[PDB]
From a paper:
The abrogation or reduction of O-antigen expression as a result of wbmF, wbmG or wbmH mutations implicates all three genes in the biosynthesis of this molecule, and is consistent with the hypothesis that these three adjacent SDR genes catalyse the UDP-d-ManNAc3NAcA to UDP-l-GalNAc3NAcA conversion, which is probably required for O-antigen synthesis.
The SDR triad is conserved in WbmG and WbmH as TYK but in WbmF Ala131 superimposes onto the Ser/Thr position. Structural analysis of these three wbm SDR gene products also enables us to distinguish between them in terms of potential catalytic chemistry. In both of these enzymes, the pocket that surrounds the active site is hydrophobic and featureless compared with other SDR enzymes; the lack of side chains capable of acid–base chemistry indicates that the functions of these enzymes are likely to be limited to oxidation and/or reduction and probably rules out specific 3,5-epimerase activity.
Author numbering:
A (entry chain B): -6 to 244, 248 to 306
B (entry chain A): -1 to 308
Write the structure that this text describes.
């Protein structure tokens, strides 16, 4: 039915996570039909209320029969692959099963089911220690952690698919229900009057609204396929983030501390090919990105369970 | 210098040739193999040799093998590759299998783990001969899963050597251009050579570096194993023609390489020479000729054992 001429039946793996739930909140009010598959390893049941147009299967992308049955009953036109394992750096076996084998399973099931477009999200950890920052899209993959090695292979399998695939390599995305990293940490700590420390690292940040716009473009028939960096292309230090929080919240000068052994000095993506090929560009700058995150904390707390669905 | 060696994939070409080299020296050897491609004939019931039939994907089986056998050394030679559409098997054997082998070896406190890597990990190289610090950029099921496998092994606390190998020739090689030209030329069938360049390594040179790799105090990490010289498939053909003594009814056509066929894959072994002091001794003509001489004696067979069975 609606939206007229472009109703999607969207199968979203990992739909109970941050990105998944934010996409559901974006698409469901438009009339799209959504099916989520999640094992609740990190995602939350509370972000998936029993509303019309939304179904939820508690299961794993590693379970290939659960997937064939779900693709067969639901008949999606589109797939968003957002399921990932990462929480235990030493559980290589779970990373490989979810991130490699689960990607392969989704790919095979999508191809059989005839889906029009498949959207995957890739961690910038795929680049490992880059030689060039901002990282060009044609830079090699060079992961050196369980999460990066497994995601790298996952993406590589997906790119062999006969289904048109977009894999978005992502900046640190901010928005509703983000509850980890420097933004919430500096916010809670500064309100608690606790000592903060800034890693001596450059990172990039993307506002949820800009993430949503490229996700929309990525699922349109006829649009480009392949791997794409999604960023403003600007990098900001952890200290710069801290400074925005401090001023926002209104509290000895903060020490610049690290970086840890496995911490890459600078990770900032070059989005130039994505601008060219999609005509997309990130509209929300750094200050507004962090500020809107902090504004969300003021209203709902540092929580990962506040649903904007009725 | 007595070794208790656990060899996964020991029924295959490299594994079985290793066993023939090491078992006469008094080493105790356990093989784990699922016989996907390796043959039961190459592993006779002799003193010093144990065979468990099973998969590196089976974490339970592996734990029980490492516990009972207590290896001092591990040679990880198991790989899946035969069906390029069977991504799930490639990922299970090559990624999960490598992870199970790494974890089990770590737990059992092995002195040294030896891995073999396909040059498909390099994808389409930017520089030939391929430097050892070149990126991994695989684009096939076999190259992707093996790349991930090796990367997981490199995260082990056990000392690891991973050898990126030229095309190894020796007893029981029954695939590739060498046996194909030998058989076809003797039968009067038309041959064609792809216009590609490759490297070839005699078994004797392979045994030498494998030996060095298993010795305490030796270097660790990734290494290219090669003469460092490349030869076209036409050059291989030419050696086979002359050796077989055939007369051609038309010149061999040299044809443009396939879609997925990398034009030139030759490895630069300099770091291996620097750190190991190893250098490949057998030149191209002698390497090809030694393969053809083996076929003259035994035929193109992968079931002839050089071990003396009771
Ligand atoms: N949020 C970011 O800024 C960011 C940056 C780079 C890449 N990514 C990628 O985007 C995707 C979503 O990230 P997120 O930030 O929303 O994280 P998230 O932890 O909130 O993950 C999404 C979900 O995956 C689920 N999951 C894990 N294993 C599963 C399994 N085997 N079967 C089904 N579901 C499973 C979790 O329960 C979770 O809800 C991931 O692939 C991640 O690697 C995110
Ligand atoms: N021979 C070469 O020139 C060459 C070149 C580069 C890399 N390598 C690497 O060297 C290693 C051995 O190669 P090969 O030429 O001997 O090939 P091979 O096919 O003869 O041997 C691989 C062996 O692994 C076994 N196997 C497959 N899946 C298994 C599983 N799940 N559990 C246990 N065993 C399993 C097969 O039965 C087979 O005996 C492989 O890792 C390969 O990728 C070989
Ligand atoms: Mg092989």
């Amino acid at each position: 039915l609606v939206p007229r001429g472009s109703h999607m039946r969207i199968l979203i793996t990992g739909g109970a996570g941050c990105l998944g739930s934010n996409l559901i909140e974006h698409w469901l009010p438009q009339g799209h039909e959504i099916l989520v598959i999640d094992n609740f390893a990190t995602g939350k049941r509370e972000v998936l209320p029993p509303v019309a147009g939304l179904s939820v299967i508690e299961g794993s992308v590693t379970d290939a029969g659960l997937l064939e049955r779900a693709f067969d009953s639901f008949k999606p036109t589109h797939v968003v692959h957002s399921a990932a394992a990462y929480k235990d750096p030493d559980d290589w076996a779970e990373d490989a099963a979810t991130n490699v084998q689960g990607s392969i399973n989704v790919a095979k099931a999508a191809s059989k089911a005839g889906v029009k477009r498949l959207l995957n999200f890739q961690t910038a950890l795929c680049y490992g220690r880059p030689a060039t920052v901002p990282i060009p899209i044609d830079s090699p993959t060079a992961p050196f952690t369980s999460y990066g090695i497994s995601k790298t292979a996952g993406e590589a399998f997906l790119m062999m698919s006969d289904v048109p695939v977009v894999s978005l390599r992502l900046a640190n995305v901010t928005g509703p229900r983000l509850a980890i990293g420097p933004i919430p940490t500096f916010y809670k700590r500064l309100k608690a009057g606790q000592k903060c420390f800034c890693s001596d690292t450059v990172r990039d940040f993307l506002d949820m609204s800009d993430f949503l716009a490229i996700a929309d473009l990525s699922l349109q028939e006829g649009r480009p396929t392949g791997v794409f960096n999604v960023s403003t292309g600007e990098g900001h230090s952890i200290k710069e983030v801290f400074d925005v929080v401090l001023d926002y919240v209104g509290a000895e000068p903060v020490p610049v501390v690290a970086p840890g052994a496995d911490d890459v000095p600078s990770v900032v993506l070059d989005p130039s090919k994505t601008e060219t090929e999609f005509g997309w560009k990130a509209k929300v700058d750094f200050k507004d990105t962090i500020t809107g995150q902090l504004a969300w904390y003021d209203k709902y707390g540092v929580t990962d369970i506040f649903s904007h669905l009725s």
